[PDB]
Write a protein that binds this ligand. Sequence first.
Ligand SMILES: [Mg+2]
Ligand SMILES: [Zn+2]
Ligand SMILES: [Zn+2]
Ligand SMILES: [Zn+2]
Lengths: 336, 54, 48, 124, 88, 166, 449, 109
Amino acid sequence: MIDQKIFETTLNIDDPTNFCTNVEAHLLKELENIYVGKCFKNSFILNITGVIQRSPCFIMRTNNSGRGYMHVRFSAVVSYLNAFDLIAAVKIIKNDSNIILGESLLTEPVTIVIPSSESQNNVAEVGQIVPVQLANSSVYYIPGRQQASATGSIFIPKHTFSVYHVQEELTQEQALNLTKLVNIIEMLLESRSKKDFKQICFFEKLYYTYSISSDEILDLKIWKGPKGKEMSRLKPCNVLSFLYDALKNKNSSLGFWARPPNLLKSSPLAYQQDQNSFNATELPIICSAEVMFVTLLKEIINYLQFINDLCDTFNNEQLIKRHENIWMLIEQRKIG
Amino acid sequence: IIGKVAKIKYIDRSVMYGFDEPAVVDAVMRPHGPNDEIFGLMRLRYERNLNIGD
Amino acid sequence: GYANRKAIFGLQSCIVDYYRRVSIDTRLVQQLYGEDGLDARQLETVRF
Amino acid sequence: RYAVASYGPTDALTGQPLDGKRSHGGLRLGEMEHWVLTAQGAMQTIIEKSHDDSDGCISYICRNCGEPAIYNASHPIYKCMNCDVQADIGMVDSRRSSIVFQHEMRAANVNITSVLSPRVFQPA
Amino acid sequence: MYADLMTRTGQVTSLEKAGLNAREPSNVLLRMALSSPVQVLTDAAVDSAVNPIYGIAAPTLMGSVPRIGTMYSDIIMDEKYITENYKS
Amino acid sequence: PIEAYIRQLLVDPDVVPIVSEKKKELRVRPSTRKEIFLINGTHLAVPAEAPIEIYGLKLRLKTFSPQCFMRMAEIGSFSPETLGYVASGANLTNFIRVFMKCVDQETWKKNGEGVVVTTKENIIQFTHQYIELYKFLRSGGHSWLINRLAEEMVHRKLDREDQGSH
Amino acid sequence: EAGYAEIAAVQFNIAGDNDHKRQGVMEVTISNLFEGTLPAEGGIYDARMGTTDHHYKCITCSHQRKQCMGHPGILQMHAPVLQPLFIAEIRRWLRVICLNCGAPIVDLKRYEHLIRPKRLIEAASSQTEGKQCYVCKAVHPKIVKDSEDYFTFWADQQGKIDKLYPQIIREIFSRVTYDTVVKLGRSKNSHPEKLVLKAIQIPPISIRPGDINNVIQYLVRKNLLIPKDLQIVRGQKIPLNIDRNLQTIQQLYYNFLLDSVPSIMRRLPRKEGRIRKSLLGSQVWSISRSTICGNSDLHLDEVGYPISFARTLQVAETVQHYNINRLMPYFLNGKRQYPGCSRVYKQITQSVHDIEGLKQDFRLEVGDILYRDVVTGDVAFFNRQPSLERSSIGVHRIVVLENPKISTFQMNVSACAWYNADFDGDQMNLWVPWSVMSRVEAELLCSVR
Amino acid sequence: IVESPSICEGFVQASSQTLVIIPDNERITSNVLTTFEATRLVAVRAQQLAINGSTMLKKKYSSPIDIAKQELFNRKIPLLVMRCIKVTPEGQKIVEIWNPREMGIPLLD
Ligand SMILES: [Mg+2]
Ligand SMILES: [Zn+2]
Ligand SMILES: [Zn+2]
Ligand SMILES: [Zn+2]
């Protein structure tokens, strides 16, 4: 995830006289030369946005060099990768008996190690571009490295979901916090509409948990995509409209919330019920409205990014046919 | 002043004259130690006049 | 030598600060150095 | 009489010159000479003699935990084997005898953590 | 200077190891350097002593220089003067 | 799988001390020395391998100051899980308290406030809620939240000491 | 990338097993020293702990001998050992806590009014033998120190004697709560559990270049002999060979740390120790010494300096646009005529070159550092030992004596009052500042005026 | 009860400070440079001239030390003296900034 961070550092200055002629330009130049494109303080710095505040140029006191130093507190655009995160374009660079190595081709440089024990793997031959999902482990940010270290496997959709039991109302402050994720969702949706509809339909039919019966697309005036299975007589609700209404304090967020595999993960639909009518295989998770909203939202961002970036990477049918083996492995593992 | 090499091809375990004032080699001999092993004995002489600071 | 080294290790932390006080890192030893704030190399013997 | 050099034989442990004429090392600026130079205020002479001319080196210390760190500008190494993900290494001007001295105290199961001087920022 | 040091705490302290303990107990590095490092170091570890760096011996045992004399006041580059008068 | 595995995993943190009553139920040996309590309220430690019987689990709801969270954001390198844990501890958030509060009754009381659970089913519920809470703390959610919160709080502090002051 | 920093404070603590496990870079597993010409991996000379020979670099920091400060290693003890420097502290903890449940025996609130350094010391000083525990109903024995070594403890319960093996002490200490530690004065970092070690720290190669290594090797060898799965419980009878092996291991560690206090802690104390010889004083380069002499033609702020010494000591001049013309005659003379130079540092290559190995350079490039001979008018620090006064080191203007037969430092007789000197055989040191910063400070502060 | 150590303590990294500059009309230290301060200023300027060489001095000198001394005497030295007065427990670092181009110089030439 691309976000904003604030760092503190100390820069050495070899020529204090020349440095002080233009402190802001030289400071930005040195910060970019040192920190852009590297891992530092549990993050990967993409851009140096600015310098919030600095120190005077002190002169080093414990040596006779005459050089200077300066404390800099600077704001940077960084990236952080979480567990279960979807990376739609990683290139296989080494496939041997021990491990598989991949390098993501996206705006979040991460190198992914892939175990050979799983039958999902050992099929992405060297040179192929496959989409993977990260494991439930922390992504390592070794200081000074130009990539991130992560573990993951070729993405196979899961057949299991979770139910969130909300017993706490959504506060207005929490709603004003969540409208930022709502705006991110809006941006991703409006960027998706600019892309190719056939690619969207193919890639959503491909990674749907069930098998799509036939060509049938639901349009909600904000999200457009093929329809899948239903759940008896239960009807989904748009999360975005629910949040925008909860801004006006007009809806109750309590109850049993769930996103079963029948829904399209990239769609803002969700199932809120007054009873636990979901066929969950685990105990419902008692929480508040903020927790469940954050989880479902971040899931929608994740899958929207996944689908859009999959369409961005795979632009022609030639790569589709070159990766038809991966697509067959995807299609084979679905529940009837 | 004394050349000495140990056989490993060889390593130079030599003795270098580390004094500011030059000397003259006065006597060189190869006597036999208590273990009947050769050691090198050298006597160096210095012509010492009286000079400032003595 | 025995007495000099014990006197220096007891007294060396006394340093004139920006108020002309003598302190040990925060703690006052003198409110003003020599009670007059002067250097000993800059004194003149004068009759009143 | 004796006069040596800018360089010569060095002790393997302290990193300082050897002792006197016979070993072709340096001469000693002892405990009482540092008292006189400190009394005079000549601190840049103490840096020149006790650091530049004896054993002064660079020690790297992590801000986050105060332990010695590992830095190498060439063959990039930037790591700390106590926190190892949140390392913030700052270089301190030290001398080899002091780093050996702190290593010896840690050998005696005494933990030495150095609190680095904090960052200071203009309020502007 | 002698009398003001020896009477700083309201009691007459000495110029021995005992007097240094009374005036500067937390200066382990000064106190280690005087007479007996092993006993002072052992006490400091069990007490979890924090030793601020000040004076002469504490910076010196840590490889640094005392903040005394020419090092007492720190110098900073005149940012505004250089921009008007100097060029890159 | 087995309840022993879960209730031994949960003992690792310094939080959630356990109450012991000599009986035949819930035999656990911790993976390290653990400070536990007894019925009638006596605090004793046990070494890294000691068979202790679980009358019930009491999590202590730790409280901190917002200054601790400010200092951690100042350092700016902590994991999101630790950041969120301290934020909930300092009441900057409430995730720990909202995942939990399955407290049975006031069945056991002492100085530290917290969640006390002394029975079979609700120990399982407590373990499930603990697992879900820490799975939330590590997840993609609450990673955006805690990072945004830390960034905006530190930036507002900088602006108020900088733009609102002189 | 590593910004400038300074040390503002230093904290002292007891290092436990976790500290050694984090800070260690490798684990010592074998008693082999060298594999061929290289150090054996896993031995006490492993290169991950640093390099002392030019034949290899450090595996950890990838630095040469000079820039590598050493890195510590780990040795997993098969049987736990007590910390040699804190044995007394261990005793204070065995006389206060119950040996069966870990609860305190003394009344903690009785010692609350004391200052926290003294609480444990004064609570352990009270008699505690025969006291009854309030929570487990056990009679506290008397902890008797073995008189034949510095580390063995016995539990004496009304004549029934038991040997408190270090594992038993560890199990007793791990039963102490942090509340007991805090209410007894000690800090949370001084929990008694850290007083028993199962993973010792092998010190970095930087402090044992190349006697101490013999002790470490013997310690590893005897540690290997102890069974890896040994277990000790209070009261269990122990085979005699195993008991003497444990005694040997603990005594080896105690002699490694506090022998006659080769040991680590004997390096510190005396005048020839680490603190007084290496840290408070210093061997230095670029310094000279000679017998002093009288010369009534020298001013009080002048020192007569032999020409042979003036061509040994050097002054470092950085080549710039304002001094290229003045420094050029020094460069052309080299080491053949006086005044000349000996050495040039080039910024273009970042290296030091001898002046005889370069003769194709018509001039010097701005930014180079020329090490020129000492000339008349240079300032020099001039010192006589013992340095009892502030004038015992003074800065004099150098007058170079061109006569090659003169080997003395000559000064005016009226300058002897600064140094308490005379001409009956006194010798004085003389070093010439070469750096600009020290050469400014010599003129403005340390001049004998 | 005093329980196990928490993350709220155990911080080794001291918190950052805010540089608080005393207003020029409230400064208490002397308007005259000490010999230590003048020596330090000249030494730093001379070393920086050995690095850069760029000066606004009209006269020409063959040494960095002479240029630094004449810059100090002619009030053209591009340096400032910061006299650290106090470090407050709440985070501030109260200092005084002195301009050596308008202070009294103790040195002679
Ligand atoms: Mg005499
Ligand atoms: Zn660290
Ligand atoms: Zn190394
Ligand atoms: Zn008991």
